[PDB]
């Protein structure tokens, strides 16, 4: 007897490798026609993690009006370029794409997504389409009007500017982002006006907003039941190993049940994490990116020595409390929350007081090179 | 060639182990024709086969 709960949840099954790496939005927010035309998703790249010290504004709490330290995750979010529009009909068999309209000129970044050997290829991806856009200017309008009258659901095609990131990959990430304004005609017009235009992170999300982060977790390879499902280690006396499950099944049913913990893949899985609060939407064009109202040092959002295995963030970034799935430099999907946030914790404004910029490459103790120089005085490499 | 017999004869002639027998790598053809104790002695006299010195076992640290 001695009843105990299950080891693991039978909702994240199968425990297999994800069929994707970008991470896809499985459900866009419900469309409200009264709201202005806006996007429901964005793509960024995880740069790393750092500290945050802030004053709590939670009445009735022991830490009210007190200092609290929280871990935050930095996601570099350079502006995304809109290059296409997709219309979705509402057939009794689900949403069905009717047609796709693309921009006149597609950059090399987005065009590399369509190829597996870009340099060896002739790079003739959007050639006849570009010719049609240049010399017809009639079929594009016809397709846009078709999306206007049909296609109750409208999504734009946007690709990341991965060339502005310190990543070796030149292949940009392309994703369908839903537009959740109103007046499907206005949605199409907004997409047409934003063709070959860059949409910024601050125009999609705002301060203290609760969002969802979508991405593929870190790969871990095969793993035994002890670490894959959290099963109890067998005693030291156990013959033929102990990092297993003792009883895999009973007699009739004379089969191994799907609910029994087994060894196998334990990482690289698609996950959506709910209720991530935006602590700061920083711009890459100001030298006070990591400064606060209570700490006026002219420093940007990058630890000295650079982010570990990422580099230096030189574009717009979003700071999220807690952790997000996936390793560093992985592309992450930020999605607007599908729920309503009325709790005081969700609605509490966040005012950062200090941002850690010490090196994450060790036990760093200096926030700026100027502070390091002030503490260390002059060194042997500095005197001569 | 195969100088196993020559090395054994050289060790016997030099009254040392086979580990202390040195044979000239540039005179393999000449050494291979020895096949006799008298020829091994001729090789030793000509300097083609020598007895390597013992490895160092100094006792300076022990004496100090």
């Amino acid at each position: 007897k001695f009843e105990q709960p299950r080891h693991g949840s039978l909702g994240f099954l199968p425990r297999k490798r994800a069929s994707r790496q970008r991470g896809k939005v499985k459900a866009f927010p419900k469309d409200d026609a009264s709201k202005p035309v806006h996007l429901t998703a964005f793509l960024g790249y995880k740069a790393g993690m750092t500290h945050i010290v802030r004053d709590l504004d939670r009445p009735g709490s022991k830490m009210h009006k007190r200092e609290i330290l929280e871990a935050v995750t930095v996601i570099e979010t350079p502006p995304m370029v809109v290059v296409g529009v997709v219309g979705y009909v509402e057939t009794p068999r689900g949403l069905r794409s009717l047609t796709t309209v693309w921009a006149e000129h597609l950059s090399e970044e987005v065009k590399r997504r369509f190829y597996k050997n870009w340099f060896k290829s002739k790079k003739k991806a959007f050639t006849k389409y570009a010719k049609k856009y240049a010399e017809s200017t009639q079929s594009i309008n016809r397709e846009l009007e078709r999306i206007k009258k049909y296609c109750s659901v409208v999504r734009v095609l946007a690709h990341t500017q991965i060339r502005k990131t310190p990543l070796a990959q030149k292949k940009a990430h392309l994703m369908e982002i839903q537009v959740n304004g109103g007046s499907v005609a206005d949605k199409v017009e907004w997409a047409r006006e934003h063709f070959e235009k860059t949409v910024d992170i601050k125009s999609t999300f705002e301060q203290n907003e609760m969002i969802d982060v979508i991405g593929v977790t870190r790969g871990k390879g095969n793993e035994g039941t002890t670490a894959r499902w959290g099963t109890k280690r067998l005693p030291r006396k156990t013959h033929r190993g102990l990092r297993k499950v003792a009883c895999i099944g009973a007699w009739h049913p004379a089969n191994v049940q799907w609910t029994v913990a087994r060894a196998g893949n334990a990482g690289y899985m698609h996950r959506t994490q709910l209720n991530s609060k935006i602590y700061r939407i920083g711009a890459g064009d100001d030298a006070k990116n990591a400064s606060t109202d209570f700490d006026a040092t002219e420093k940007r959002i990058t630890p000295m020595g650079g982010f570990v295995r990422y580099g230096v963030v030189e574009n717009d970034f979003v700071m999220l409390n807690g952790a997000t799935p996936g390793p560093v430099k992985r592309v992450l999907t930020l999605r607007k929350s599908l729920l309503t946030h009325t709790s005081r914790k969700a609605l509490e404004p966040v005012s950062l007081k200090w941002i850690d910029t010490a090196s994450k490459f060790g036990h760093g103790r200096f926030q700026t090179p100027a502070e390091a120089k002030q503490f260390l005085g002059t060194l042997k490499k500095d005197v001569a | 060639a195969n100088l196993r017999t020559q090395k054994r004869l050289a060790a016997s002639v030099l009254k040392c182990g086979k580990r202390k027998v040195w044979m000239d790598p540039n005179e393999i053809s000449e050494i291979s024709n020895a096949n006799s104790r008298q020829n091994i002695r001729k090789l030793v006299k000509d300097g083609l086969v020598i007895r390597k010195p013992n490895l160092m076992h100094s006792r300076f640290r022990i004496r100090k």
Partner: protein
């Protein structure tokens, strides 16, 4: 236990069968942790306690009239480090506790050594009878 409110979750460093010093003047020295109040149901998990908890303890060394019986006690110090909401990990030089009653009133009169702020805020009697608080 309806003393002053709620306490934040902290690392548990004193499981059952742990021997800790007695910080009061009741005459005990070897508080032997027997059980911890507020422990839920979980297979194979030893009930453990941190500073400010209400462990049940017996006296192994001290006045004979305090031995061979179970009395409530409050942990005031622990060697295991725990972090606060401000991101500061702190720990003490020893594990210590004070004999109390179910209502929380201390059986002793004075407390030797420093006391944890969480325990002092949780139990007003311990805060009154303590000196240096962290």
């Amino acid at each position: 236990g309806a003393a002053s409110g709620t306490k934040y979750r902290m690392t548990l460093g004193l499981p059952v069968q742990a021997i800790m010093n007695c910080a009061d003047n009741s005459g005990a020295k070897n508080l032997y942790i027997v059980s911890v109040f507020g422990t839920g149901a979980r297979l194979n998990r030893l009930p453990a306690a941190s500073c400010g908890d209400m462990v049940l303890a017996t006296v192994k060394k001290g006045k004979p009239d305090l031995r061979k019986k179970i009395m409530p006690a409050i942990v005031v110090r622990q060697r295991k480090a725990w972090r606060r909401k401000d991101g500061v990990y702190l720990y003490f030089e020893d594990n210590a506790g004070v004999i109390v009653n179910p209502k929380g009133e201390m059986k002793g009169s004075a407390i030797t050594g420093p006391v944890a702020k969480e325990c002092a805020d949780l139990w007003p009697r311990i805060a009154s009878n303590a000196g240096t608080v962290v």
